[PDB]
């Protein structure tokens, strides 16, 4: 192997400006990092700058450097959708024609009618809502009637809440499996069906640790599958295992925040493995992008940047660090949906003694998967062109 270990970091939703097809998605004008930099009156990300972030694109407080630490470019998304699953599945070598759907006005009558028909249960709610707020609103009715609270949010999710002492947990799980099957349908394709059991009483409801998430498997066998099948390590950190429904994962590390995600990355740097360590930093998307909160987003990016020097200190000569994103989620943009943007790519190894240079623009996210696959001598993905030899 050229590299013994590859550390891949997805800064979730950290877009670097509207993609060529942004108009199709209602994303003209989008610019995640650039708009945040303007709001912050200059972002402070000196470590990303040292890697060559500004060499990709200059933004307020983010300037180019004469000798970037590693190689740099951006990537263009080829798949139809701008959701997390699409972005990640493409990154690991796939092409996804069918986009996952979001439901700002709730789910179509047709879908909920069939779910009622298959379960013998009534559905209430059917709207975007905070999980805790909707419990306050409808939890009592749910308890008295045995109906199901169905709701959604800014992401591609169908969530089903029911009181544990009214609807048995195993019945809630069965219902969610039925919903998961019904939503394998392009008309209502949801990324995730989530069981949301709760306990307590009106004015005092608590959601239990018995949450279960029902994901779809990637529409193809990924570079992660190939690594695992060839006996390499594939360490998933944060949402990564869930995003791929565990496909090709050899160890999974749960995280609670971006800072915790950087701690787990450091943990993997301390491990003797051969293969891939794959981190998703999800706070950017979950707390700041969808909430259209550029101040929180800017602070999170600065908190993340401050962690990088320890990562640089731990990387070995035969380690490669890859930093990218899976789409945009511009916190100064209409609505609450993701944005169709280019994503940054930074590629750094301490063995790059003269620093890096500009890579040709990546025409699909799958170029990352192809690079990983070629490095480890496993079956090349169908899509994507490796940049391994450029490094």
Ligand X SMILES: O=P(O)(O)OC[C@H]1O[C@H](O)[C@H](O)[C@@H]1O
Q: Does 157 bind ligand X (CB under 6 A)?
A: yes
**Interaction partner, residue 84 (Mn ion, ligand X, none; CB < 5-8 Å by kind):** Mn ion
* 290 annotated as ligand-binding: yes
Q: Does 238 bind ligand X (CB under 6 A)?
A: no
- Please identify which residue in 31, 326, 367, 374 interacts with Mn ion, judged by CB under 5 A: 326
- Please identify which residue in 84, 159, 183, 324 interacts with ligand X, judged by CB under 6 A: 159
**Interaction partner, residue 157 (Mn ion, ligand X, none; CB < 5-8 Å by kind):** ligand X
**Interaction partner, residue 247 (ligand X, Mn ion, none; CB < 5-8 Å by kind):** none
Q: Does 26 bind Mn ion (CB under 5 A)?
A: yes
Map the chain to HEC letters.
Answer: CCCCEEEEEEECCCCCCECCCHHHHCCCCCCHHHHHHHHCCCCCCHHHHHHCHHHHCCECCECCCCCCCCEEEEECCCCCCCCHHHHHHHHCCCCCCCCCCCCCCCCCHHHHHHHHHHHCCCEEEEEECCHHHHHHHHHHHHHHHCCEEEEECCCCEEEEEEECCCCCHHHHHHHHHHHHHHCCCHHHCCCEEEEEEEEEECCEEEECCCCEEEECCCCCCCHHHHHHHCCCEEEEECCHHHHCCCCCCCEEECCCCHHHHHHHHHHHHCCCCCEEEEEEECHHHHHHHCCCCHHHHHHHHHHHHHHHHHHHHHCCCCEEEEEECCCECCCCCCCCCCECECEEEEEECCCCCCCCCECCCECCCHHHHHHHHHHCCCCCCCCCCCCHHHC
Q: Show the binding pattern over residues 279-318: x = contacts Mn ion (CB under 5 A), - = does not.
A: ------x---------------------------------
**Interaction partner, residue 128 (ligand X, Mn ion, none; CB < 5-8 Å by kind):** none
* 163 annotated as ligand-binding: no
Binding footprint of Mn ion, residue count (CB under 5 A): 7
**Interaction partner, residue 92 (ligand X, Mn ion, none; CB < 5-8 Å by kind):** none
- Please identify which residue in 32, 73, 84, 241 interacts with Mn ion, judged by CB under 5 A: 84
Q: Which residue, 143 or 190, has its beta carbon nearer to Mn ion?
A: 190
As a whole number of angstroms, the distance between CA 49 and CA 346 comes to: 10
* 39 annotated as ligand-binding: no
Q: Does 12 bind Mn ion (CB under 5 A)?
A: yes
Pairing relationship of beta strands 212-215 and 192-201 according to DSSP bridges = antiparallel
Q: Which residue, 131 or 220, has its beta carbon nearer to ligand X?
A: 131
Q: Which residue, 238 or 328, has its beta carbon nearer to ligand X?
A: 238
* 333 annotated as ligand-binding: no
Q: Rule CB under 6 A: which of 272-331 touch ligand X? A: none
Q: Rule CB under 6 A: which of 182-221 touch ligand X? A: 196
- Buried-state track 260-299, b at ≥16 Cβ within 10 A, e below 16: bbbbbbeebbeeebebbbbbbbbbbbbebbbebbbebbbb
* 326 annotated as ligand-binding: yes
**Interaction partner, residue 26 (Mn ion, ligand X, none; CB < 5-8 Å by kind):** Mn ion
Q: Does 341 bind Mn ion (CB under 5 A)?
A: no
Cβ of residue 199: shortest distance to ligand X, in angstroms?
15
Per CB under 5 A, which region of 22-30, 136-144, 268-276, 361-369 contacts Mn ion?
A: 22-30
Per CB under 6 A, which region of 26-34, 111-119, 155-163, 181-189 contacts ligand X?
A: 155-163
Binding site for Mn ion (CB under 5 A): 12, 26-27, 84, 155, 285, 326
Binding site for ligand X (CB under 6 A): 130-131, 153, 155, 157, 159, 196
């Amino acid at each position: 192997n050229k590299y013994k270990r590859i550390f891949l970091v997805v800064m979730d939703s950290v877009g670097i400006g509207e993609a060529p097809d942004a108009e199709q998605f209602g994303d003209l004008g989008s610019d995640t990092i650039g708009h945040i930099a303007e709001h912050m009156n200059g972002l402070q990300m000196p470590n990303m700058v040292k890697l060559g972030l500004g060499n990709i694109r200059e933004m307020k407080g983010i300037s180019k450097v004469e000798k970037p630490l590693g190689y740099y470019t951006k990537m263009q998304e080829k798949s139809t959708g701008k959701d997390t699953m699409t972005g990640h599945w493409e990154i690991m070598g796939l092409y996804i024609d069918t986009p996952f759907q979001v439901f700002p006005e709730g789910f179509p009558k047709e879908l909920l009618d069939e779910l009622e028909e298959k379960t013998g249960r009534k559905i209430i709610g059917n709207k975007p809502a905070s999980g805790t707020e909707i419990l306050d609103e409808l939890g009592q009715e749910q308890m008295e009637t045995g109906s199901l609270i169905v709701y959604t949010g800014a992401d591609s999710v169908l969530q089903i809440a029911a009181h544990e002492e009214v609807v048995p947990l195993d019945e809630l799980y069965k219902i969610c499996k039925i919903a998961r099957e019904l939503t394998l349908d392009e008309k209502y394709m949801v990324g995730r069906v989530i069981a949301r059991p709760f306990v307590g009483e009106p004015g005092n409801f608590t959601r239990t640790p018995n949450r279960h998430d029902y994901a779809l498997k990637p529409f193809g066998r990924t570079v992660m599958n190939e690594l695992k099948d060839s006996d390499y390590d594939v360490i998933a950190i944060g949402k990564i295992s869930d995003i791929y429904d565990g496909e090709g994962v050899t160890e999974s590390l749960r995280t609670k925040s971006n800072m915790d995600g950087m701690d787990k990355l450091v943990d993997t740097l301390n491990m003797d493995f051969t293969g891939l360590s794959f981190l998703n930093l999800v706070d950017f998307d979950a707390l700041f992008g969808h909430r259209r909160d550029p101040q929180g987003y800017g602070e999170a990016l600065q908190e993340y940047d401050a962690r990088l020097p320890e990562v640089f200190a731990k990387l070995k000569e035969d380690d490669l660090l890859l930093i990218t994103a899976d789409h945009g989620n511009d916190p100064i943009h209409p609505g609450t949906d993701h944005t169709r943007e280019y994503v940054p790519l930074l590629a750094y190894s301490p063995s790059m003694k003269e620093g890096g240079q500009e890579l040709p623009l990546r025409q699909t996210f799958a170029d990352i998967g192809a690079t990983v696959a070629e490095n480890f001598g496993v079956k090349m993905p169908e899509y994507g062109t490796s940049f391994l030899n450029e490094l």
